[PDB]
Amino acid sequence: TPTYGDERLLREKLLTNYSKSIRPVINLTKVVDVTALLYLQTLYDLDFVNNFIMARYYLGLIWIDEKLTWNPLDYNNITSIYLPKDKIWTPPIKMCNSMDKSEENDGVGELMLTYTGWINMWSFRLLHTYCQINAYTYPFDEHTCEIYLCVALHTINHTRIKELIYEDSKFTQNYKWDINVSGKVNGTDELFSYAFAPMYLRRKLTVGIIAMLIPTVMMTILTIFVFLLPPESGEKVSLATTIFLSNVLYLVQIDKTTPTNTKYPSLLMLYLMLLSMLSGIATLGSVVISKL
Amino acid sequence: TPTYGDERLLREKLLTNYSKSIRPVINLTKVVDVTALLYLQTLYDLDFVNNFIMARYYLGLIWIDEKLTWNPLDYNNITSIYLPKDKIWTPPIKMCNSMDKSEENDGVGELMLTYTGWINMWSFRLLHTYCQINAYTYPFDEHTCEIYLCVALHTINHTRIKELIYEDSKFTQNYKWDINVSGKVNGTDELFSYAFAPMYLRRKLTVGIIAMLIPTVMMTILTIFVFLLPPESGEKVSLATTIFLSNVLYLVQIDKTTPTNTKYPSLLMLYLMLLSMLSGIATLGSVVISKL
Amino acid sequence: TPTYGDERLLREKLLTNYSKSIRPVINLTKVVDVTALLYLQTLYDLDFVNNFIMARYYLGLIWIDEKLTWNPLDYNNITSIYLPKDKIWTPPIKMCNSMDKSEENDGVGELMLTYTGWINMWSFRLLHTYCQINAYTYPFDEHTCEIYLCVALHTINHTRIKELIYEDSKFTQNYKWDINVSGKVNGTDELFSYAFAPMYLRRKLTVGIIAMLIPTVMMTILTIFVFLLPPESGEKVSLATTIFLSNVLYLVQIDKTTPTNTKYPSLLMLYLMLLSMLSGIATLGSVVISKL
Amino acid sequence: TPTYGDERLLREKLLTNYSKSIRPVINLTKVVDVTALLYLQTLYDLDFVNNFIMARYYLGLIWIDEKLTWNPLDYNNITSIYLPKDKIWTPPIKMCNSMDKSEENDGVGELMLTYTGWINMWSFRLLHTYCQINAYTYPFDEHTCEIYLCVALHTINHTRIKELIYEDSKFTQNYKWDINVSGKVNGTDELFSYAFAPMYLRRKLTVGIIAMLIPTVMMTILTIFVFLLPPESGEKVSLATTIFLSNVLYLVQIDKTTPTNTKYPSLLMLYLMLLSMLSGIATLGSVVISKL
Amino acid sequence: TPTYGDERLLREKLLTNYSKSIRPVINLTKVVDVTALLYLQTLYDLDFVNNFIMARYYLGLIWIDEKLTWNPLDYNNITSIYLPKDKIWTPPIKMCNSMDKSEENDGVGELMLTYTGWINMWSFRLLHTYCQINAYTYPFDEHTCEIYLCVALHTINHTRIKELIYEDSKFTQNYKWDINVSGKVNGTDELFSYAFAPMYLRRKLTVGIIAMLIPTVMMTILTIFVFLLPPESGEKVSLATTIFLSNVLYLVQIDKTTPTNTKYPSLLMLYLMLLSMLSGIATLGSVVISKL
Ligand SMILES: Cc1nc(C(=O)O)cc2c1[nH]c1ccccc12
Ligand SMILES: Cc1nc(C(=O)O)cc2c1[nH]c1ccccc12
Ligand SMILES: Cc1nc(C(=O)O)cc2c1[nH]c1ccccc12
Ligand SMILES: Cc1nc(C(=O)O)cc2c1[nH]c1ccccc12
Ligand SMILES: Cc1nc(C(=O)O)cc2c1[nH]c1ccccc12
Ligand SMILES: *[C@@H]1O[C@H](CO)[C@@H](O)[C@H](O)[C@H]1NC(C)=O
Ligand SMILES: *[C@@H]1O[C@H](CO)[C@@H](O)[C@H](O)[C@H]1NC(C)=O
Ligand SMILES: *[C@@H]1O[C@H](CO)[C@@H](O)[C@H](O)[C@H]1NC(C)=O
Ligand SMILES: *[C@@H]1O[C@H](CO)[C@@H](O)[C@H](O)[C@H]1NC(C)=O
Ligand SMILES: *[C@@H]1O[C@H](CO)[C@@H](O)[C@H](O)[C@H]1NC(C)=O
Ligand SMILES: *[C@@H]1O[C@H](CO)[C@@H](O)[C@H](O)[C@H]1NC(C)=O
Ligand SMILES: *[C@@H]1O[C@H](CO)[C@@H](O)[C@H](O)[C@H]1NC(C)=O
Ligand SMILES: *[C@@H]1O[C@H](CO)[C@@H](O)[C@H](O)[C@H]1NC(C)=O
Ligand SMILES: *[C@@H]1O[C@H](CO)[C@@H](O)[C@H](O)[C@H]1NC(C)=O
Ligand SMILES: *[C@@H]1O[C@H](CO)[C@@H](O)[C@H](O)[C@H]1NC(C)=O
Ligand SMILES: *[C@@H]1O[C@H](CO)[C@@H](O)[C@H](O)[C@H]1NC(C)=O
Ligand SMILES: *[C@@H]1O[C@H](CO)[C@@H](O)[C@H](O)[C@H]1NC(C)=O
Ligand SMILES: *[C@@H]1O[C@H](CO)[C@@H](O)[C@H](O)[C@H]1NC(C)=O
Ligand SMILES: *[C@@H]1O[C@H](CO)[C@@H](O)[C@H](O)[C@H]1NC(C)=O
Ligand SMILES: *[C@@H]1O[C@H](CO)[C@@H](O)[C@H](O)[C@H]1NC(C)=O
Ligand SMILES: *[C@@H]1O[C@H](CO)[C@@H](O)[C@H](O)[C@H]1NC(C)=O
Ligand SMILES: *[C@@H]1O[C@H](CO)[C@@H](O)[C@H](O)[C@H]1NC(C)=O
Ligand SMILES: *[C@@H]1O[C@H](CO)[C@@H](O)[C@H](O)[C@H]1NC(C)=O
Ligand SMILES: *[C@@H]1O[C@H](CO)[C@@H](O)[C@H](O)[C@H]1NC(C)=O
Ligand SMILES: *[C@@H]1O[C@H](CO)[C@@H](O)[C@H](O)[C@H]1NC(C)=O
Numbered sequence A, B, C, D, E: 001t002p003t004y005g006d007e008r009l010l011r012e013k014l015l016t017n018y019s020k021s022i023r024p025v026i027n028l029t030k031v032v033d034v035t036a037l038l039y040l041q042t043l044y045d046l047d048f049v050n051n052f053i054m055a056r057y058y059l060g061l062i063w064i065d066e067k068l069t070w071n072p073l074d075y076n077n078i079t080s081i082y083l084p085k086d087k088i089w090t091p092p093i094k095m096c097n098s099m100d101k102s103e104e105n106d107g108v109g110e111l112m113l114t115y116t117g118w119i120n121m122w123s124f125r126l127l128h129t130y131c132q133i134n135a136y137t138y139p140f141d142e143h144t145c146e147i148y149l150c151v152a153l154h155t156i157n158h159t160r161i162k163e164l165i166y167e168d169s170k171f172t173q174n175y176k177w178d179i180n181v182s183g184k185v186n187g188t189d190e191l192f193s194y195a196f197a198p199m200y201l202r203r204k205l206t207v208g209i210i211a212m213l214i215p216t217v218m219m220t221i222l223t224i225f226v227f228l229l230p231p232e233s234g235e236k237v238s239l240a241t242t243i244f245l246s247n248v249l250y251l252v253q254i255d256k257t258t259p260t261n262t263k264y265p266s267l268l269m270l271y272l273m274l275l276s277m278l279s280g281i282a283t284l285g286s287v288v289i290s291k292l
Helices: A004-014 A207-227 A236-255 A267-291 B004-014 B207-227 B236-255 B267-291 C004-014 C207-227 C236-255 C267-291 D004-014 D207-227 D236-255 D267-291 E004-014 E207-227 E236-255 E267-291
Strands: A032-040 A042-047 A052-064 A080-084 A098-100 A110-114 A118-130 A142-151 A159-168 A177-180 A183-186 A188-190 A192-203 B032-040 B042-047 B052-064 B080-084 B098-100 B110-114 B118-130 B142-151 B159-168 B177-180 B183-186 B188-190 B192-203 C032-040 C042-047 C052-064 C080-084 C098-100 C110-114 C118-130 C142-151 C159-168 C177-180 C183-186 C188-190 C192-203 D032-040 D042-047 D052-064 D080-084 D098-100 D110-114 D118-130 D142-151 D159-168 D177-180 D183-186 D188-190 D192-203 E032-040 E042-047 E052-064 E080-084 E098-100 E110-114 E118-130 E142-151 E159-168 E177-180 E183-186 E188-190 E192-203
Touching: A004 A080, A032 A142, A032 A192, A042 A177, A118 A142, A142 A159, A159 A192, A183 A192, A207 A236, A207 A267, A207 B236, A207 B267, A236 A267, A236 B236, A236 C207, A236 C236, A267 C207, B004 B080, B032 B142, B032 B192, B042 B177, B118 B142, B142 B159, B159 B192, B183 B192, B207 B236, B207 B267, B207 D236, B207 D267, B236 B267, B236 D236, C004 C080, C032 C142, C032 C192, C042 C177, C118 C142, C142 C159, C159 C192, C183 C192, C207 C236, C207 C267, C236 C267, C236 E207, C236 E236, C267 E207, D004 D080, D032 D142, D032 D192, D042 D177, D118 D142, D142 D159, D159 D192, D183 D192, D207 D236, D207 D267, D207 E236, D207 E267, D236 D267, D236 E236, E004 E080, E032 E142, E032 E192, E042 E177, E118 E142, E142 E159, E159 E192, E183 E192, E207 E236, E207 E267, E236 E267
Parallel strands: A032 A159, B032 B159, C032 C159, D032 D159, E032 E159
Antiparallel strands: A032 A052, A042 A052, A052 A118, A080 A110, A098 A118, A110 A118, A142 A192, A159 A183, A177 A192, A188 A192, B032 B052, B042 B052, B052 B118, B080 B110, B098 B118, B110 B118, B142 B192, B159 B183, B177 B192, B188 B192, C032 C052, C042 C052, C052 C118, C080 C110, C098 C118, C110 C118, C142 C192, C159 C183, C177 C192, C188 C192, D032 D052, D042 D052, D052 D118, D080 D110, D098 D118, D110 D118, D142 D192, D159 D183, D177 D192, D188 D192, E032 E052, E042 E052, E052 E118, E080 E110, E098 E118, E110 E118, E142 E192, E159 E183, E177 E192, E188 E192
16 A cells, blocks of 8 residues: 655655746647636625625636656555645636635645646635626616636736636525526637636515515605695695605615616616605695795 | 753654655555534624624644654653644644634644644634524524534545534623534535534523613504594694604614525514504505595 | 756756846946836726725836846747746835735736846736825816836936836726726936826716706705795795705715815805805794794 | 854854754753733723724733853853844743734744843734623723733643733823723633733713713703693693604614623613603603593 | 946855844944934825824835945945845834834835945835824814834844934825924933824814804804794794704714814814703793793
8 A cells, every 4th residue: 555655755756857937848839728617605795885796716726737747556556645735836827806805825725636647726715806786677686797717927828728617506595696607618818818707696585675665665655645635735845844854864875775886877766866856846836835 | 851852852853754745644545533622712793784703712623643653761751742833744624614814824833742643733713704694583583603614625535524522611701692502523524524513692681672672662652552543633644754754764773783684584674664554554544534 | 849858957047146136237337127017907996085096907017137038049949938026136116106905915926038038027906096086076076196106215327117108908897987097108217216197087977976966956946945935924934944954964964975185175065055054044034034 | 342253153052952842941841931021002992892992012021041041251241132033932922812913923023032041022912802891880881801811832831921910001191091900910820821911991081971961961851841741731742752753863872882792781771761761651641631 | 347246246245144133233332323214205094083193104214234344446336235125134113103004014125235334224104103182172173193113122222213304205285184294303212212203283274164164153043043032932942942953963973073082072062062052941941931
């Protein structure tokens, strides 16, 4: 059976004439094809006001090294070893659309090497990835957020993102957003290789938002009532004034949750503006009637 | 008695042909069984809006090294030494459900080594661990939060979490949540080893929340009074209007503390929506009566 | 074709008598001219209250090394290599107007070296750059923010910023600000070299702000109405009082979004102050009339 | 006089056969007694809602090394040197009740060594130390916060905290809290050595809080007036309603400053709840009278 | 002309028998006099509630090394070189009144060395420096903030701050505070050397705050009017009640901007408390009149 001394001999032979910074190909004319695997773990939140979405992923990079291959029959059948991440060449795959708030660095950890040269490198990344949030159809709204991977500095003649496989790990259920992330896309080769996984997000229809809607609809009933009140009821001015105050309060409060960076404003904005305008016109008519 | 020179000789012999990155077993076919000890120290807070809980723990990892054993009779009876954490192989146990906001790194500190090979490695971890918070039964609510440990990259054929012992250190009393963390669970071996400790949290019934409830219940009395007021009292419209304004203010204010990510909304939400709806219907009836 | 051994020989010869800290010129009387390229990627936000703007850029530095040149015909036609950033002299170009909140350090990464000595060094920088925000013409306001680059410690006799080319990468569209960053400016040589790229920002006229304006203009109609109400209408005091309350609420709420550090306050401030003063004078006149 | 060469010889001889990780005693049966000095510099704030207190301290550790002693007459009377902190054994004294938000690490700096072996090690620590805040007697409230020091991993048979001397440096005056930190406590030896300094904090009676109280007491006068108003005054219902609204606003606003984690709620909570209940009963009586 | 090889020889000779941690004097009885230069660049903000002020400075330290001097005629007239900051002895000047939130460390960068031994070391420091803010005369208020420099661990017999020259770089204009920082102060030698630069700050009288004042003064007019209203006007109670509500709202809102840690509260606090008390007494008198 393989032993500690056997693995020591193997590592000593492997790292003898190895340069960490030279691209690992016998012929430098060859490109290194990297295939990436992005497995969303938990969508923490979807921040509207900052136009960010916070999630945690499991990024796996796979490629092939031609200087790190051996015959297992010469080392008592050792078929894989674990090397420190900072001793070996590693593709410079950067998340160039996200703010990487992970608690580990990209040069600490380990990677698994196989006797054929294939390297597996897995990591945890917590990302704050920028999204252009369209709040038009609030609260029945849908969004599309793209997470980008891109080679840092190497041209497509040196390092390439062969493929990107994105899936959902289903580790936890959300109860707030319907997530749909699943597919397999080839990399795009225009000067520097890159790719992106699209995340589609539909807000789930919990009854809490329906309960929040209830006051609005009854306010619709109340405003129509006061605007179709008799001209000489004897409480039109005060009633319309208080209704206008409450409407202004609602119009102010909705803004603090809704985003200001959208292709279109929300129909709810435009509808509450119409309702406030109707309340104001009702108050003006009441004042005119009292004058007359 | 053992001396400084004796310990120098011991360390020099121990670290002679030692490789930090090779798994510490004479026969590489053997697995290293790690037993973990998680001792909650102080539950700082339970953040509802972010669905996180902040606490401080004392994580202890214990395993056995077969290359670091000696006969104490040959070194004047030295039975244990202290080694820097970054000179020895260390299991890659990651907290893969938590945001590790500790102020130390996982490669600075020390570990105790015994002449039989057993290594003790203890550390402080401040964790922001994700929890799915069910606010259904607020303020008589209970929650269950699971803290996960999982081997980083090694398969169950290489590194395993043998066992997880979780307890409560009772270092401080909370006065806000009844904490119940105590047990002993075997590790789960499905590809990569992992385990989790369940924390059950029940909000304590301090009289401060009762005092907060008082205004609500008396408001129930006041709304029933106004809704069962005589049709021609002469203050129904104004009274009901002001009650509705206060009701809307309460319904808005409760939202800012309660969470939006729940299996069900809180009964308090649904009940205050019913109360506000009754107030609105009372105002409509008052308007109809004034019309008639 | 060039091979791994050829590149090993090349690097070994290049780095033989190289000093990382000596300025890379054969004759020390010569200056090193650095040309910088700043390519704005995405304008995240424009923070009014903190007088900052958050954006992400792509900073590229180009210069020439005279100790790192070779004849490609002697190494099987190798024409470029990749070196670790911390092995070679690198100009100390600091962003001396910004808070660099990037997640990487200025000594980790790679740089491309060409057989003629020309070095390309590209990086991602997330900057919080200070801007003096003039909110005079809100919400039809325009701003100018200058991003500075400056050599750290070397005098213009040693290191110089030859030129600065700034452009907009058009990676995403904003929908909130009209960005206009494009040009080419020589460096300024007054003791220590520096340069700056001007960003002009005009807030876009989305209909959401128009919807926000609607309540204000109708409030203008309502205040003029109440101030030109008949002296003995019988609701002047109460109506004017409520209008004044709403006016004070709006005047308070506008402050929390607008900045306090401006050459002039916003015309909207001065106009809402005039409107509130008119409402107060109307209330005083109503009180005087009721007295009479 | 002593010279640079003399100090070079001294350091070279001292560090020859020195091991950074071996506990610095000739006989390993001996314990190393550490005496700590904690000198509070400025109490920044006392955060009620997070149950933390932020302050800056000056932590000094003193112990004795038996491998770092020399005869000063053999080095031209050199009596003390300065060594880098990371070349020498240093006790692992951790602040195990606090979140260490300092801007330096525990392995960068310097320490003073004396020819007798005595080592002085001084540092700046900014600490966010957890406190259980009893807001019962607000705003005449007193608090007790304990700052803990504890050996990290060594047992009382290896490393001990001999003594802890805590004082107040009086560097600045607070004007918000009366601080009383002064004493001298032996270390506690139960498995692992530790100790704690008690900080007693009494909120100072500035007239600003009295000014804040004034509206409350006059509101007491107003509520008693309305509750002892004649049954048929003709404004009882409206007056009581407005008083109830303002009281509810105060009861809501007080919560946002007061803490939710206390042994008892504040008497101010319970008293304002009594006042709100009395206002509600007054309004109910008014409604009953209007019915009759 | 001097060449790369000449500078290589120079550095090799300079660093031959150099110890980074030995104080750089031939005779150890001599003190090293450090002169510091602090050049404020931009005052970002003056945080009232946290009692901090955020600014960016340019700290320059100058001292003399006696082991790093050469004759330029022996190296082809080389007169200055650039060394890495972490290879040479550096005075441990700490900002011991501030929270150093800079993005660089105190051991990365470069320093210029001259053939006479004089070393220049310049750096960027972003500081959050504690200030005791006296808000007595708000908004015509003045403040004094002292920024401290102090040697870390060396006594005045080893390292001294000879002098401190503080100036204002006038890089940007503020428009919010009148800054006056300029002078030259000797260091204070009481055990450990230190010094401080006083910053005087007077809030500028922009017309925005005048506009903010306008509502207050007109409210003074309105409260005097209602308090000197006829006893039987027929709107005294309701008018005084609404005025009192608005007064309470303003008294609450002013607190959130003003500080709680002051020698005296602001005259604006005391004056608005007087105004609120007068409004309350007016309401009480109105109630008494209605009773009579
Ligand atoms: C489906 C899946 N999920 C996760 C997760 O962290 O959720 C992690 C892995 C994974 N497949 C792997 C294959 C090799 C290494 C790690 C993983
Ligand atoms: C019950 C307990 N509690 C704590 C705590 O920090 O609260 C720490 C330890 C502990 N047992 C240990 C055994 C070995 C090393 C450290 C600890
Ligand atoms: C137009 C442009 N944009 C970006 C971007 O990140 O948006 C990056 C680059 C770029 N040109 C380059 C030339 C060499 C290396 C990198 C880049
Ligand atoms: C009373 C006192 N105060 C402070 C402070 O930073 O406030 C610092 C020290 C000190 N005594 C010392 C003795 C040796 C080294 C440093 C200090
Ligand atoms: C007046 C002034 N201002 C600044 C600033 O960054 O504002 C920087 C410097 C300076 N003088 C120097 C002399 C040597 C090195 C740097 C500086
Ligand atoms: C490298 O190229 C040579 C000739 O071009 C070829 O014979 C050899 O097989 C190549 N090596 C690899 C690993 O492709
Ligand atoms: C080598 O190991 C593989 C996998 O464990 C096994 O299938 C094979 O039979 C082994 N061969 C020898 C010669 O031991
Ligand atoms: C996810 O989105 C894709 C494309 O928008 C669609 O084809 C697929 O059906 C979606 N998933 C589900 C479960 O509907
Ligand atoms: C991706 O590249 C492979 C390589 O030939 C090609 O067969 C395939 O059609 C491409 N597209 C997709 C979607 O896989
Ligand atoms: C390793 O394996 C050999 C044979 O398989 C056995 O004799 C030996 O005892 C094993 N060593 C250990 C430490 O289990
Ligand atoms: C070795 O040490 C242990 C524990 O201190 C003790 O029980 C034993 O008697 C010692 N043996 C010798 C030979 O000193
Ligand atoms: C803690 O929870 C477990 C399982 O939910 C239960 O068996 C145990 O009784 C609980 N602890 C206490 C003190 O009740
Ligand atoms: C855990 O594993 C041990 C190992 O045999 C087994 O005896 C035990 O039943 C398992 N379960 C628990 C709860 O300990
Ligand atoms: C350096 O200077 C010498 C004489 O001044 C000149 O001959 C030589 O070409 C110069 N080298 C470079 C690289 O400019
Ligand atoms: C060297 O490489 C360049 C670019 O690949 C090519 O144009 C040239 O013909 C090559 N020369 C030789 C001798 O291989
Ligand atoms: C950008 O600004 C410059 C100078 O202010 C101006 O010349 C140019 O026309 C602007 N860009 C566009 C697209 O108008
Ligand atoms: C910049 O410097 C070059 C160098 O000669 C000069 O030709 C040019 O006029 C300068 N100005 C601009 C705007 O390029
Ligand atoms: C160490 O122990 C021996 C005998 O036990 C004793 O003679 C010697 O003085 C001790 N050394 C110290 C430094 O205490
Ligand atoms: C050694 O130094 C001390 C303190 O400076 C002094 O008191 C003593 O006289 C000196 N002795 C000699 C021999 O220089
Ligand atoms: C500080 O507290 C201790 C114990 O609580 C007390 O003895 C001492 O008198 C207090 N300090 C002052 C100045 O009163
Ligand atoms: C602390 O320990 C010393 C050591 O003997 C002892 O004399 C003293 O009584 C103890 N208690 C205090 C408060 O110092
Ligand atoms: C050091 O001291 C000696 C005698 O005390 C003196 O001759 C020499 O000049 C001094 N060196 C320096 C650099 O002051
Ligand atoms: C040395 O350089 C200085 C400054 O460049 C110059 O004034 C002096 O003439 C030069 N001397 C020689 C001998 O080159
Ligand atoms: C700055 O303050 C000092 C002392 O307070 C004063 O002498 C000086 O005149 C002030 N500066 C100006 C420009 O008035
Ligand atoms: C500072 O020290 C020098 C040194 O002699 C002295 O001349 C001067 O008077 C001192 N005071 C000031 C303000 O410079």
